[PDB]
């Protein structure tokens, strides 16, 4: 595998134009296949050494008609010109024609059966006005050759065969045609005896698909990583992905898809699905940024952003507007752009907030505050003078890694008095909490501004079971529920780490007992359809491949594959 204009496969076009009298073309000695066309024009060397060149495909052609273009390889004065076109193994041309003209000193081109090399019947073959004083081919070559040698003979292969083998055959007999994965002719009936591959190549055996990474294991009636697991590197199957290249399930792509992320489980980098929104870091505000605050000109650059490499400053200047009427006020609806933000490396500074927005439910998906960058006098979270905020609303906030916490002058803020910051603020609390002069605790309790009864002794981020730090029982979509759908209801659910999850499909709702035990289909009371081993599938293996080939089995009476 190598780019166009050493290796074995030439991905691209082999172009050699205007070369001196002597050139180290010995690097081209090892070339088997060319994907494009061969361009040799206006050269001065005597020989083009491509002895292993067996197949020139021709997905694209020079002059819109030629897979091999050779001309003007001589000089009007000097005596240095192309004399030999060493293509001793040139067998097939899948597409395109041949153009060899105006080569004054090039011999043995008017003796080659190009109709045997060219597969495209409608292609144009022009070979004339070449060498004049050319000696006959060697007695071995039997008339057709590439040069004056016993090893420079053209090997004929193509032969009109039975209609059972449409073109692709190795003889006139019907029991001698090629394989279905052969691009042209062949040598034998086997898959390891072809000239060129129609798709891929394991190690000389042309297969339509490289060894799948996930094959069927006879042991555990399911799927498992395959021993070979060769990945697609374009035309060559490789067990290990190339340099920097990431494994995209079945292909070795240069970079992961827009809907997938570059995960790295079993050593190598693999492109796994994001499952929602892909992680994305963004520039923030504060010391080291471009801005003093977020505003009308910054709010648009936070779309689909999950991580904040920096901080987020919310000043009155950003909300109300610029003092010099340069930048208009910030539309409160655009604040919903931070709903994708999960982590902030630095601090969060909210000194201003839209009056009709009584909380920070915009940051309801905010999980982690690093505090690797602090504000003012060592603060990671500063909410000051917000006379409209009734509750915080950081339902997803579980960790504030460092720094102090400043929450004051909010006057109408509640639901935060019962919060156990130790279960959120990492490191000894000591004197890191600066929370005072908000809404009096007695005022909140009197008006019922406290945590929902379904919340534990931890605390809350506002009213309702959704703003709880820790549920007394279970959680469902971030909502504290008393029971999961264990014995009744749809969908039937199970429990894990005090959180509700739906049971795997094809598992009928078992009344009275638990339907599922885990997330997979390996853990059910019974199957709603079929049961291939210790599993529960909607259909028995119709045509899945394992380590040997396709695997299938009829539903043995009691629905057991």
């Amino acid at each position, epitope marked *: 595998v190598c780019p166009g204009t050493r290796c074995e496969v030439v991905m691209g076009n082999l172009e050699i134009v205007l070369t001196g009298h002597n050139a180290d073309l010995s690097f081209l000695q090892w070339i088997r296949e060319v994907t494009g066309y061969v361009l040799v024009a206006m050269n001065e060397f005597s020989t083009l050494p491509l002895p292993n060149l067996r197949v020139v495909r021709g997905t694209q052609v020079y002059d819109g008609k030629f897979a091999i273009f050779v001309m003007l390889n001589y000089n009007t004065n000097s005596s240095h010109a192309l004399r030999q076109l060493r293509l001793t193994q040139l067998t097939e041309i899948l597409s395109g024609g041949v153009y060899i003209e105006k080569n004054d000193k090039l011999c043995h081109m008017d003796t080659i059966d190009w109709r045997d090399i060219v597969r495209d019947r409608d292609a144009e073959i022009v070979v004339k006005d070449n060498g004049r004083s050319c000696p006959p081919c060697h007695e071995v070559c039997k008339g057709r050759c590439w040069g004056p040698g016993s090893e420079d003979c053209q090997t004929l292969t193509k032969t009109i065969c039975a209609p059972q083998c449409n073109g692709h055959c190795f003889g006139p007999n019907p029991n001698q045609c090629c394989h279905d994965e052969c691009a042209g002719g062949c040598s034998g009936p086997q898959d390891t005896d072809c000239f060129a591959c129609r798709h891929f190549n394991d190690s000389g055996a042309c297969v339509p698909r490289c060894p799948q990474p996930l094959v069927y294991n006879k042991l555990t009636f399911q799927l498992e990583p395959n021993p070979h697991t060769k990945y697609q590197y374009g035309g060559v199957c490789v067990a290990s992905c190339p340099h920097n290249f990431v494994v995209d399930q079945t292909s070795c792509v240069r970079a992961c898809p827009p809907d997938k992320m570059e995960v790295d489980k079993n050593g190598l980098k693999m492109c796994e699905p994001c499952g929602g929104l892909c992680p994305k870091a963004c520039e923030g505000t504060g010391s080291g940024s471009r801005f003093q605050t977020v505003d009308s000109s910054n709010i648009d650059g936070f779309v689909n952003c999950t991580k904040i490499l920096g901080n987020l400053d919310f000043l009155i200047t950003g909300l109300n507007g610029d003092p010099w009427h340069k930048i208009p006020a910030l539309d409160p609806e655009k604040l919903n752009v931070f709903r994708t933000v999960r982590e902030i490396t630095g601090y969060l500074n909210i000194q201003s907030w839209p009056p009709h927005m009584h909380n920070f439910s915009v940051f309801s998906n905010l999980t982690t505050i690093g*505090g690797r960058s602090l504000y003012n006098r060592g603060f990671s979270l500063l909410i000051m003078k917000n006379l409209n905020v009734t509750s915080l609303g950081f339902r997803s906030l579980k960790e504030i890694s460092a720094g102090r916490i400043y929450i004051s002058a909010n006057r109408q803020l509640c639901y935060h008095h019962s919060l156990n910051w130790t279960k959120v603020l990492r490191g000894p609390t000591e004197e890191r909490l600066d929370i005072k002069h908000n809404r009096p605790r007695r005022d909140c309790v009197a008006e019922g501004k406290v945590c929902d009864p379904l919340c534990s002794s931890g605390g809350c981020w506002g009213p309702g079971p959704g703003q709880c730090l820790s549920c007394r029982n279970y959680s469902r979509g971030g909502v504290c529920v008393t029971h999961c759908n264990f014995l009744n209801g749809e969908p039937r659910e199970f429990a894990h780490e005090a959180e509700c999850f739906s049971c795997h499909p094809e598992c009928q709702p078992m009344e009275g007992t638990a339907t599922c035990n885990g997330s997979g289909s390996d853990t059910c009371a019974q199957c709603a359809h079929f049961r291939d081993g210790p599993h529960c599938v909607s259909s028995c293996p119709h045509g899945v491949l394992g380590a040997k080939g396709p695997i299938y089995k009829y539903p043995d009476v009691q629905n057991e594959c």
Partner: antibody
Amino acid sequence: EVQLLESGGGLVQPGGSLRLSCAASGFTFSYYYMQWVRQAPGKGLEWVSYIGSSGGVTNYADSVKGRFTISRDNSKNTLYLQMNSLRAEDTAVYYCARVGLGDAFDIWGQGTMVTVSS
Amino acid sequence: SVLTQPPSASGTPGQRVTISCSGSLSNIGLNYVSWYQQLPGTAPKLLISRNNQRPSGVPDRFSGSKSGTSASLAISGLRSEDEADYYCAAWDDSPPGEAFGGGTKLTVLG
């Protein structure tokens, strides 16, 4: 001026223990995460551990996890590293670095060589 | 948890050399990239911070860049004082720590 001064290194035997000290000056030590990076003679830079500003988060390399323990005294402006059960492959030059803007190591120590030989 | 650098790099006084740095989404892909120069027999210092920033002392010759899960260090105008070890580093997420590079040994001929 702004300086991270290290100490506590020296020649020790396998199984032996050592406590490295890193005194800060010129800046507010309580506002930054602190790092430990060693470098074996011939080898490259190897991350050892780091600690939060308030001594909260603490993560180690798998090469030292369980044997080494990072801590800090913000009242005394000092970063510590409790190296216990020292192995021969722990022989290196232990630098203490401060995280800066953009999580970059802008301030390093002077060296303090730690040697573990039988 | 390591970044991938070329083990060696060479050039002549006045030539431009490049030092690439491979990584992953866990480290470089979601964090800033920083370069550190280490003169022989000395402690490493901050050469490049936050992908492309240079502190007061680093000339305009050095220039770092970041594109995806990889980063580069370009040194336009090589000098005999640039002969040192060059390490790249990036904060790592899923394994909480610092992802360092193997190290690049820049050799200035002349």
